[PDB]
Structures are given as structure tokens and as C-alpha cells.
Amino acid sequence: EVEQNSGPLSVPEGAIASLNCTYSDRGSQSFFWYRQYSGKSPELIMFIYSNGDKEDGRFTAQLNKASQYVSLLIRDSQPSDSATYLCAVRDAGNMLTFGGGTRLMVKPNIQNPDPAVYQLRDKSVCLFTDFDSQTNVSQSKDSDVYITDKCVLDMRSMDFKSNSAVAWSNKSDFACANAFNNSIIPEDTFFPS
Amino acid sequence: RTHSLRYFRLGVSDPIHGVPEFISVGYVDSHPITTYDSVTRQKEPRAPWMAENLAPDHWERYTQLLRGWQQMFKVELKRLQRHYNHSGSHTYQRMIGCELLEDGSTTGFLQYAYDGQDFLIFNKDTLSWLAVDNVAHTIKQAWEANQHELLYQKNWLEEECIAWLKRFLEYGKDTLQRTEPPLVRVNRKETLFCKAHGFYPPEIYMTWEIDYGDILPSGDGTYQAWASICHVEHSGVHMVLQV
Amino acid sequence: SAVISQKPSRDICQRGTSLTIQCQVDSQVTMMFWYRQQPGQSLTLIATANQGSEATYESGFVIDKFPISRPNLTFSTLTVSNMSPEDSSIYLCSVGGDSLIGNQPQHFGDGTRLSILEDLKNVFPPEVAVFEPSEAEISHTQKATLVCLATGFYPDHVELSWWVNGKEVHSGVCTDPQPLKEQPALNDSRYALSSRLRVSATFWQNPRNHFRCQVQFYGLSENDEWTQDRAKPVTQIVSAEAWGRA
Amino acid sequence: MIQRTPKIQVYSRHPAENGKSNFLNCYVSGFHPSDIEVDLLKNGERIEKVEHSDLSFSKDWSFYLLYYTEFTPTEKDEYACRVNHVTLSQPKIVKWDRDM
Ligand SMILES: *[C@@H](C)/C=N/c1c(NC[C@H](O)[C@H](O)[C@H](O)CO)[nH]c(=O)[nH]c1=O
Ligand SMILES: [Br-]
Ligand SMILES: [Cl-]
Ligand SMILES: [Cl-]
Ligand code: NA
């Protein structure tokens, strides 16, 4: 048959994330949810056979065989749950049909933001960090300057989280004040000397 | 009238010449519908109405499953023969199935047997296995520690078996749901004989120490029986025959 | 439940050669499958491994391209014959169905990451450099963030880890999920990868603390021939260290 | 290791009348294990055109089989069924008690 999932999904931290999946074969019996981080293999997180809800920790699997949709609810979702979630459906022949997957991005909660662009030495590297999850980092306009994407680091002992992006270049005119000029950074971004 | 679908598996370890190492035969009611063994390695139709309504992808898919099922039966039979510390030829049997009652209620059963005696019996309403000894108890723990195995089997018994049963009942509606009345006659044998034959379904009630005869296959799809020492009920039709 | 072991974890191979990868299960399970998947893309089923006979292939995958042999329920091999760069992917072994512990769901091995190159003369280890935190950040946030750059490696078979005081650390670390092409216009472009380690200002202001960025690189092996006028780009560890200061 | 002796029942498909074609049935049921050989006899001689059903299964793990052949009954000919099974030291012959 065919399994249909969505594409990219964004969910605020602590909120409930809902991934929905639909299938065409009415004769299908078992329904599986797999989680797959970027560099790893699919990992089965839970499964469901009959109509209704099925809870396992923060996960909740919902099956409506009449309307032929399967859902996975991640209550109190955190950035650890940011991955691609695969919907798998089993038919009578015990064959498994996979969906295209839905990538989930759980934006972290930056309680006290403090956007700033710092410079560090042993080339030289500029660091744009402590911005809130609403700001997006955009790829640089020049090919001589390299800009990464936003990264969520967790200081689990301090219960602290911070977004960060790194820009570096070998060009002589490159400076941290002009590093992220293609991205919409907050007005109050701290550009120290 | 109740209708039922069930499948058997027969595993013979170290078989004598001629006997297949694995056999699997499926029935709707009293009719063989499917067959498979270790010699052919092919799931084949056993009733014509099965071969007319099932596309080749059906037989191809379940032949692949049956080749796996045959292999595991050899494996499971080895595990038993090394827990009992047995040598020589032994038997391992399986019967899964379901019934569809007249009132719409359903029943589901699955059990295994080793050397012709009850070994493991499943309870889909409690998700547990009734073991018969310590060897069966070992396997019972392995299965009950796997929730998927318990939910998977409960699902097939309650959902997929009943779905296949109705699908097979439509495929062979001309044969499985027909009714042929018995041809009843009385004979005064000596050494009294209400003999009936040529009826279908084989469920028949005859009465008048009263001696009964087995309900035997005639060979053409009908059955025959007798009662010795006449009232006959068959498919809700009562017949009376005097001396 | 069933433990699936794929061999090899990774391999870098030349175009025009063949590679046989295999899959070994710790237990006997009925059904076995072979998948391929690009990183960040969808899971594509190649074929179904049938025990003792040929595999049942999906549309597009032919038996002469991907020969699959399964002698028993616990072992099967997949061969990529006449390899081309278009065949570079991560090949996954899957197993599910009946077993001695009951019907198991489909599980996956850790996969084989296969990268087929036009030639092996452009395999390069990375350059690893570490950058000590900004003095402005330490005053403004009372926190210290180090940054590590792994540059100029090819292909992208790297694992970046942080080691403080000799132990690998995982808290306060964020690494780019995928590397970065130093020049996207090129086909066989070299890669870059950045990672950061945030740490308390007091921890960084301890001169006795030792910070090390380690990049494990996976390149050629001992069986690969090397005739170039430079060091053989073998599997090696490249690191960059830094000490605290007040 | 369970062993159950076969139950042999010889009968005809239709009420037998001499001169009318019929089918001679031998229904072997309720035995264990499955290895068994069955022969039909016309006055002691083994009939060769004797078809049968495939081995069937019962709920109590016993097995049953149906052996049949096309034949015509007379007043002189005697038919019997011969079965050999692990539970039998010698083949057991059950004659066809004509319904008469
Ligand atoms: C083709 C219709 C043959 N089926 C078949 C079955 N089907 C039953 C079910 O799929 C299976 O027994 C599950 O393992 C139940 O838990 N069963 C069988 O034994 N033989 C067959 O030929
Ligand atoms: Br369930
Ligand atoms: Cl095996
Ligand atoms: Cl299976
Ligand atoms: Na310290």
C-alpha cells in the first residue's frame, strides 16, 4: 500500500507534539512508530494494534482503523525528542510499509535571552550565541565565509540551554560585526570590541 | 450454525523415509482449503473455490511465510528435544483458529502439542499461556516476556482470523453453506436401525441402551450415520419414520 | 530483543570494484530485509532476504547489481557489484517475525556506511583547531564557550568528541549534525565540521583543567594500496588541546 | 510419547446393492503417530487403484484418513481393509460387514 506522513514540523519545548500518519490498505493490522536521529538507525519506540490510545511514558499512540490514521503524541516534548519519526504499517502478509518520515524540531525555551556575537582565537572564529529560538540563522552570502546552523547545547548540571551558531572565514575583510549580516538577528545583539 | 477457520502444523523430527518433516493444512469448517509440506515447499489450494478467488500473490506470500514457519518448527522441535534430553523421532503439533457463532460472538484458540499431548495452551483473554510441565513453563516465560508476541496472537485470533473466515465463507458459499437433507431408512437387522446418509452438514441428531454410529464421510462431500436399539434433526428439519 | 550486527561499519571504496557486506543476528528470526538510506532522506527497501534461495527484489533493484544470499536465518550478505558513486549510501539490515521468544517487530542494525569515490587519491584527514573562549563572554555571561573546527577532510567519515581532564564529556556540547562542504560547487569537495563546548567561567579559569577536541577520522585501511607522494590517509585520530587560564 | 491405536471402519458410500457401482470406504481415525499404511483387499488381494485423502488433523492431536475405491458389489465377493501401525504387531484386517 502507501503510508503518508508530513515533512518538517516545529514544536515549542514542553508542549505536546502530534505526528499524524495515514495509510490506504484497510486490511492492515499493526502500526509501528520508529524514531531515528540524524546519524543513527531507526529505533522502534512503540506499536499499537487496536483502536484507542496507548500510553508509554511521554508517548501516546492513537489508532483509528475506521478513518485509517495513526498518531503519536509526545507530551512535554523536549529538544532530546528532535528527530525524524517513521510511521510503519503492517499488512496481512506481515509485510511492513514505511512512510517518508516527519522531522520534528523541538525549539528550546530560552528563559533569559542575551544575543551576542563574540570572537575567539587559538584563523579566527565568531560565535553568535544566547539568542532565542525564534531567530533563524541564514547561510552567508559569500563563499569565502562559512556559517553553520543553530545548535542547542544543554548544560544539564546548570539546567541551562543556549542556541549558538559559528561563523568563520579566511578573508581579510571578515569581521564578527559583518559575519551574520544575511540573518535577521535581534536588534539588541551585543557586539563587543 | 457456527463456522470456523483453523490451521494445523505437523513437525516430525528425524522422519522415517517418506514422511515429510513438516506439514501445514488449513480448514474452513470440515473442508481442507490450503496445504503445505516440506517436500513441495509450496502453499497450494486444496479447494477449487480457493484457487479461483486468490490471486498468485497470495500463494507466493504465504509460501514464503510457510517456509519460515517450517524452519522455526524444526528449530522449536530441537529446543524441546534438548530440554527433555530426547533422541530419535518426535512429534510437534500446532493448532490455531477461530469460530464465528450464530449470535455473532467469536472464539479464539491456539495450542501446541509435543508427542501427542497438550503442551502449551494460549488464553487470549488473559494474555497468558497454560503450560503443562517445566519444559513448557520455560517457553511460556519467554513468550509472556514479549508483549508483542501476546498482542500479535490476540490480534490474529480476534481480528484477522474472523476476517479471513468471512472472506473464505463468501468464496465457497456454494459448498460450505449448502444443506442436503439426509436419506433416512429403517432396517430390521438381527443378531432398530435408523440409517441416514447423503447429508451435509454432518451435524445430525438421531434418537428414538441405544447404540449410535459415527458420522462418517461418504466420499462425495456428504456424510452418513445410524442409530440402533425414529426422530432425525438436521439443519433445523425434523423427520419422523415409523416401524 | 534480537541483536543485529552489520559488518563493516564503514568502508571507502573505488569505483569499478565490488564489496560484500553481511548481517549476523544473535538469534534465529524468520524474516530478514535489506534497506538503503541516504542521511536525511527516506528509508528505501532494497529486497527481502529469502533463506536458501534468491532474494525478492523491489522495483529498481536487480539481482546482478545487489546479490543477496542467506544461507540460514541468522546470516545473510549483500554485495554491491561494479560500484559507482551513485551507490554511496547507508545499507541497513532488518530482522523481524517469529523466533524462539515469539513474534518480534522489525528491528534494524547499525548499518554500513558506504562511500564510493572516483579515486582514492583525494582522501584527506581533517585539520583540528580549538579556540579559547571570549573574554567578553566570560564577563557578560560568567560562562566560557570553546569552539572546535575540523576542516579539509574527505570523505565525511568523522566523529568529533570533547575530552576534559582525560574523560569524554557530553553535557554542554553541541556539534553540527552534518558536515559542511568547503566549496559546494565542487563534486568531491572537502568538508568542514564545527563543535562547541560551553563551560562555567570558573571551570575555564582553572589552569589545571585540560580541554581537548578529538576528531576520529575514518580513511583508507591496510589492504588499500597507496602510491601517492604523501602520507597515506589512513584511519587516524586528529586532536587539538587547550588549557584554562585566569 | 503417546501412541493410539487406529480405529478402522469399512463401509460403502451408498447403500450397497449387487450390480450397482459404488465406492468402498475405509476410515482410519484416532491414531498417533502419523506413520501408517493402509491397503484395501478384494478376497485377500491388494487392490491397486485405491485413492485416498491427504493426512488430516483432529483437535485431540490424533490423525484420520479416508481410503476409497470404485467397485461393484456382488453376493460372492468379499472386501476388507488392512491397516498396519506402530501400535500393531501384525496388520489388522477388518472385513466389510455388508449392510444386509
Ligand atoms: C495462507 C492463508 C496460509 N495461512 C496459514 C496460517 N495462517 C495463520 C497465521 O497467519 C499464523 O498462524 C500466525 O503465526 C498466528 O499467530 N497458519 C498456518 O499455520 N498455516 C498456514 O498455511
Ligand atoms: Br496494542
Ligand atoms: Cl537457522
Ligand atoms: Cl513470520
Ligand atoms: Na574547576
So where are chain C's domains? 3-118, 119-246
CB D34 within 8 A of CB D79: no
Q: Rounded CA gap, C189 and C205, in Å?
A: 39
Judging contacts by C-beta atoms under 8 Å, the chain A residues touching residue C189 are none
Tally C-beta pairs within 8 A across B and C.
49
Residue A16 makes CB contacts below 8 A (sequence gap 6+) with: A73, A74, A75, A76, A77
| Strand, helix or coil for residue C2 | coil
H/E run at residue C158: strand C158-164
Cβ contact B214:B233 at 8 Å: no
The distance of D53 to chain B (nearest Cα, Å) reads: 9
Of D35, D56, D62, which is closest to B19 when you measure between CB atoms?
Answer: D35
Domain boundaries, chain D: 1-100
Candidates C96, C111, C94, C109; CA nearest to C28 is C96
Say yes or no for a CB contact (<8 Å) between B159 and A29: yes
The Cα C44–Cα C39 span in angstroms is 12
Alpha carbon A45 to chain centroid distance? 17
Residue A41 CA to residue A50 CA, distance in Å, equals: 27
Residues touching ligand 1 (Cβ under 6 Å) are B 7, 9, 24, 26, 34, 36, 43, 62, 66, 96, 153, 156
CA angle B124, B127, B131 (to 5 degrees): 95
CA distance B76 to B59: 25
Neighbours, chain A (3 or more CB pairs < 8 A): B, C
Other CB atoms within a 10 A radius of the CB of residue C197 amount to 26
Q: Which three cell numbers stand for residue A9?
A: 514540523
The 3-state DSSP class for residue A96 equals strand
Amino acid at C138: I
Q: Is B58 annotated as a binding residue?
A: yes
- Output the 3-class SS for chain B: CCEEEEEEEEEECCCCCCCCCEEEEEEECCEEEEEEECCCCCCEECCHHHHHHCCHHHHHHHHHHHHHHHHHHHHHHHHHHHHCCCCCCCEEEEEEEEEECCCCCEEEEEEEEECCEEEEEEECCCCEEEECCHHHHHHHHHHHCCHHHHHHHHHHHHHHHHHHHHHHHHHCHHHHCCCECCEEEECCCCCCEEEEEEEECCCCEEECCCEECCCEECCCCCEEEEEECCEEEECCEEEECCC
Whether the CB-CB separation of C77 and C68 falls below 8 Å is answered with: yes
In one-letter notation, the amino acid at residue A68 is Q
CB distance D13–B220 less than 8 Å? yes
What kind of experiment solved this structure? X-ray
- Strands (DSSP E) found in C59-142: 68-72, 75-80, 89-97, 104-108, 112-117, 127-131
Please tell me whether B84 is known to bind a ligand.
Answer: no
User: C69 pairs with which residues across the strands?
Assistant: C77
For chain A, the domains span: 1-108, 109-193
B-chain residues within 8 Å CB-CB of C101? 142-143, 145-146, 149
Q: Give, for C201, the enclosing helix (H) or strand (E).
A: helix C201-204
Q: Which ligand is nearest to the CA of A93?
A: 1
Count Cβ atoms below 10 Å from residue C45 Cβ, excluding itself.
20
CA C224 to chain centre: 19
Alpha-carbon distance of B119 to B113, in angstroms, equals 5
C75: left (phi over 0), alpha (psi -120 to 50) or beta: beta
H/E run at residue B12: strand B3-12
Residue-wise DSSP of A118-153: EEEE--EEEEEEEE-TTS-----SSSSEEE---EEE
- CA D55 to centroid of ligand 3, rounded, Å: 28
Strand C112-117 relative to strand C10-14, pairing: parallel
CB B7 within 8 A of CB B96: yes
CA distance linking residue B237 with residue B50, whole number of Å: 30
Write the single-letter amino acid at D20. Answer: K
Residue A61 C-alpha to ligand 2 middle, in angstroms? 9
Identify the H or E element spanning D51: strand D51-52
Residue A142 and residue A165 in contact, taking contact as beta carbons nearer than 8 Å = no
Q: Nearest to residue A104, comparing CAs of A3, A2, A13?
A: A13
- Long-range Cβ contacts of C184-189 (<8 Å, 24+ apart): C184/A143, C185/A143, C188/C117, C188/C118, C188/C122, C188/C154, C189/C154
Cell of D72: 461393484
| Contact call for C149 and A168, based on CB within 8 A | yes
According to DSSP, the residues that pair with D68 across neighbouring strands are: D25, D51
Pick from A102, A129, A124, A136: which is nearest to A114 by CA? A129
Neighbours of chain D (3+ CB pairs under 8 A): B
Q: Is B24 annotated as a binding residue?
A: yes
Q: Is A96 on the interface with C (CB under 8 A)?
A: yes
Cβ pair A154:C145 closer than 8 A: no
Sign of CA dihedral C72, C76, C82, C87: positive
Please say whether the beta carbons of A45 and A59 come within 8 A: yes
B43 is in an annotated binding site: yes
Please state whether beta strands A102-107 and A8-12 pair in parallel, antiparallel, or not at all (unpaired): parallel
Instruction: Give the total residue count for chain A.
Output: 193
User: What is the C-alpha to C-alpha distance for residues C58 and C81, in angstroms, rounded to an integer?
Assistant: 17
Q: How far is C21 from chain B (nearest CA, A)?
A: 23
CB C77 within 8 A of CB C22: yes
For residues B35 and B32, what is the distance between their CA atoms, to the nearest angstrom? 8
Mutation to test the B interface, candidates C1, C27, C54, C100, most B Cβ within 10 Å: C100
What separation in Å is there between the alpha carbon of C72 and the centre of ligand 3? 4
Whether the link from the prior residue into B201 is cis, omega within 30° of 0, is: yes
Do the Cβ atoms of C30 and B150 come within 8 Å?
no
Q: Whose CA is nearest to atom 8 of ligand 1?
A: B7
Cell of A185: 538577528
Q: Is the dihedral of CA C39, C42, C45, C46 positive or negative?
A: negative
Contact call for D13 and B218, based on CB within 8 A? yes
What distance in Å separates the CA atoms of residue A90 and residue C67, rounded to the nearest whole number? 26
Beta strands A3-4 and A59-64 are: unpaired
C-alpha span between B63 and B34 (Å, rounded): 11
- At residue D4, the 3 state secondary structure works out as strand
* CA-to-CA separations, B240 to A14, B186, B194, B233, C96, in angstroms, rounded: 78, 11, 10, 9, 60
Residues of chain A in contact with residue C177, where contact means CB-CB under 8 angstroms, are: 38-39, 149
Chain D residues within 8 A of B219 when measuring between CB atoms = 13, 23, 25, 66, 68
**Closest Cα of chain C to A153: distance in Å?**
5
Between CA D82 and CA D39 the distance in angstroms is 5
* Cell 556540547 found at: C173
Q: Which residues pair with C89 in a beta bridge?
A: C114
Q: Which atom of ligand 1 approaches the CA of B25 most closely?
A: 22
Q: Is B144 exposed, middle or buried (0-12, 13-18, 19+ CB in 10 A)?
A: middle
Q: Hey, are the CB atoms on A153 and C146 less than 8 Å from each other? A: no
* B209 contacts: CB under 8 Å, gap ≥ 6: none
Q: Which of C46, C42, C24, C52 is nearest to C33 (CA)?
A: C46
Where are the domains positioned within chain B?
1-178, 179-243
Contact A29, A38 (CB under 8 A): no
Residue type (1 letter), C155: P
| Prior bond of C125 cis (ω within 30°) | no
CA A185 to chain centre: 20
Residue type, B90: H
Interface of C with B (CB under 8 A): 1, 28, 30-31, 48, 50-51, 56, 73, 97-105
Residues of B in contact with A47 (CB under 8 A): 148
Closest approach of D76 to chain B, Cα-based (Å) = 20
**C-alpha gyration radius of chain D:** 14
Å from CA of A53 to ligand 2 middle = 9
Q: Which amino acid is at D71?
A: F
In ligand 1, the atom with minimum distance to the C-alpha of B8 is: 19
**CA separation for the pair A51, A54 (Å, rounded):** 9
Q: Which of B65, B155, B163 sits opposite A49 (nearest CB)?
A: B155
B7-31 core/surface letters (b: 16 or more CB in 10 A; e: else):
bbbbbbbeeeeebbbbbbbbbbbeb
Calculate helix-pair angle for B134-144, B147-155, nearest 10 degrees: 90
- Considering only CB atoms, D55 lies closest to which of B23, B117, B224, namely B23
Question: How would DSSP label each residue in chain A?
Answer: --EE--SEEEEETTSPEEEEEEES-TT--EEEEEEE-TTS--EEEEEE-SSEEEEETTEEEEEETTTTEEEEEETT--GGG-EEEEEEEE-TT--EEE---EEEEEE---SS---EEEEEE--EEEEEEEE-TTS-----SSSSEEE---EEEEETTTTEEEEEEEEEE--TT--GGGTTTTS---TT-B---
Q: Is the dihedral of CA B173, B175, B177, B180 positive or negative?
A: positive
Mutate to test the interface with B, among A26, A46, A49 (most CBs of B within 10 A): A49
CB neighbour list of residue C214: distance below 8 Å, 6 or more residues apart: C128, C160, C161, C162, C163, C237, C238, C239
